[PDB]
Amino acid sequence: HPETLVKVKDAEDQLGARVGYIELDLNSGKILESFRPEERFPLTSTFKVLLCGAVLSRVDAGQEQLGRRIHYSQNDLVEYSPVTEKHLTDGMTVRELCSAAITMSDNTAANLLLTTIGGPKELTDFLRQIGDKETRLDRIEPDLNEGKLGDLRDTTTPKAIASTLRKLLTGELLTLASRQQLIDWMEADKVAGPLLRSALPAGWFIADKSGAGERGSRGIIAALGPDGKPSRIVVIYTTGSQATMDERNRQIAEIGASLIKHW
């Protein structure tokens, strides 16, 4: 809706940074609204949904087991690993790692899951195979959050990842059990949801994954809608701002508020 565009613009002005935005109709994939939809932005932790989609694809193919136990060590622990730092001695199952990676944004969990699939190049190969010609993962956590000027590594476009999320959450790319598991992880309550959950009406569904990185990178991908069912995909990215984190979050939240008001 045009009013959302005005709010995207206002976010660019307040943040001193580009903002990319797309809304899709979930059933048809039709583009309902867009701003900078084909420009590149860092994925940051929004990639963790794509990662878990690749894991679940392997589960469906009999190449992985959700119950397989992954053992790791102290040196594997990187910053912002609130779940994995509690399981050095006992390990975590693949299922537990995907829950941590998505709901808690656990960085080491994502790195371990990347090992399970064979690394960033294998994620990127999966994405290419499902028809995403843009998204690329090059590095693991935390270095993928760098947000360096002029660096194409670890980027997507709003348009690409919106279509990829639609492929993962609907249709037959994943089995029903795996689709539902991915949605369950994305819907699970989290500690703080400033970007959209904070705008979402009661009784609406949201399955979301946020991201935050260096150099102003911030983003969210989501399927949301009224009446306990998703009906749209929304993707919002920004990078480059040096405004406070609170200001970044507020500006993106106001985009969400507008989307909901003018739904």
Site stretch for Cl ion (CB under 5 A), options 3-11, 178-186, 202-210, 250-258: 202-210
Give Cβ neighbours of residue 78 (< 8 Å, ≥ 6 apart): 107, 108, 111, 141, 142
What is the Cα–Cα distance from 93 to 71, expressed in whole angstroms? 9
Interface residue with Cl ion among 9, 148, 229, 262 (CB under 5 A) is 148
Site stretch for Mg ion (CB under 5 A), options 52-60, 109-117, 185-193, 226-234: 185-193
Ramachandran angles phi, psi of 21, nearest 5°: -150, 135
**Across the beta sheet with 31-35, what order do the strands follow?**
31-35, 18-25, 232-239, 218-225, 205-212
Instruction: Find the shortest distance in angstroms from Cβ 94 to Cl ion.
Output: 25
x/- mask, Cl ion, residues 25-44, rule CB under 5 A, reads: ----------xx-xx-----
Structure tokens at 164: 């990829």
What is the Cα–Cα distance from 143 to 107, expressed in whole angstroms? 11
Nearer to Mg ion, 59 or 109 (CB): 109
Structure tokens at 6: 């005005």
Q: Is 198 a catalytic residue?
A: no
Nearer to Mg ion, 30 or 133 (CB): 133
Judged by beta carbon distances under 5 to 8 A according to partner kind, the member of Mg ion, Cl ion, none in contact with residue 189 is Mg ion
What is the Cα–Cα distance from 45 to 203, expressed in whole angstroms? 26
Q: Does 189 bind Mg ion (CB under 5 A)?
A: yes
Nearer to Cl ion, 69 or 148 (CB): 148
Q: What is the crossing angle of helices 176-187 and 94-103, to 10°?
A: 40
In the numeric block, the tokens 């469906």 are attached to 60
Structure tokens at 11: 């976010």
What is the Cα–Cα distance from 218 to 203, expressed in whole angstroms? 26
How many CB atoms lie under 10 A from the CB of residue 86? Answer: 12
In the numeric block, the tokens 């940051």 are attached to 44
**Share of the chain residues as helix, strand and coil, in percent rounded to the nearest 5:** 45, 15, 40
Judged by beta carbon distances under 5 to 8 A according to partner kind, the member of Mg ion, Cl ion, none in contact with residue 248 is none
Half-sphere exposure of 26 (CA within 13 A, CB side): 20
Interface residue with Cl ion among 210, 238, 239, 241 (CB under 5 A) is 210
Nearer to Cl ion, 166 or 218 (CB): 218
211 is in an annotated binding site: yes
Catalytic residue among 34, 45, 178, 241: 45
Q: Does 250 bind Cl ion (CB under 5 A)?
A: no
x/- mask, Cl ion, residues 89-128, rule CB under 5 A, reads: ----------------------------------------
Nearer to Mg ion, 67 or 131 (CB): 131
209 is in an annotated binding site: yes
x/- mask, Mg ion, residues 43-82, rule CB under 5 A, reads: ----------------------------x-----------
Instruction: Find the shortest distance in angstroms from Cβ 62 to Mg ion.
Output: 26
Structure tokens at 73: 């060590």
Give the catalytic positions in this structure.
45
Q: Which residues are annotated as a binding site?
A: 209-211
Binding residues for substrate: 209-211
